[PDB]
Amino acid sequence: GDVEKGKKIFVQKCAQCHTVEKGGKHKTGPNLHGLFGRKTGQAPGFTYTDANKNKGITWKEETLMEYLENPKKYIPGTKMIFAGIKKKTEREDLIAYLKKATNE
Numbered sequence: 001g002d003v004e005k006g007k008k009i010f011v012q013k014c015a016q017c018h019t020v021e022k023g024g025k026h027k028t029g030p031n032l033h034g035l036f037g038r039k040t041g042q043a044p045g046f047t048y049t050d051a052n053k054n055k056g057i058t059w060k061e062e063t064l065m066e067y068l069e070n071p072k073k074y075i076p077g078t079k080m081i082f083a084g085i086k087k088k089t090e091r092e093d094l095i096a097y098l099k100k101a102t103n104e
């Protein structure tokens with residue numbers, strides 16, 4: 001996945017919702033500053049969802065891959081904003097940024 005496209009994709013998809021970096025605040029999306037290497041239904045002092053805890057997985061591309069292109073599949077009680085990312089290609093690029101970004 002391209003980190004460069006990934007960066008822009010994140011900014012062109014999520015941006016005013018997630019941060020994936022330090023000091024990302026707590027608007028709607030949790031500041032995803034440690035996605036790749038944590039379990040679900042947990043966050044540093046942030047209002048989480050039950051449905052996420054109900055997932056009980058490890059975030060590692062392979063998992064988010066469905067979530068970003070199937071927000072009403074894993075569990076029918078998310079936020080359901082749209083279909084999903086454009087396709088797997090974009091998803092991959094997105095992840096490529098994310099892998100770094102979340103871990104700085």
Ligand code: HEC
Nearest residue numbers: 010013014017018028029030035040041048049052064068
């Ligand atoms: C707000 C308008 C959001 C947009 C746009 C995107 N996301 Fe999101 N995301 C949001 C919330 C409130 C949450 C928590 C829901 C939950 O499952 O408890 C999330 C969660 C994620 C996760 C899982 C991390 C976790 O909370 O356990 C991932 C991997 C994620 N979001 C990725 C993601 C990406 C890459 C987006 C743009 C392509 C995106 N989200 C948009 C809120 C919002």
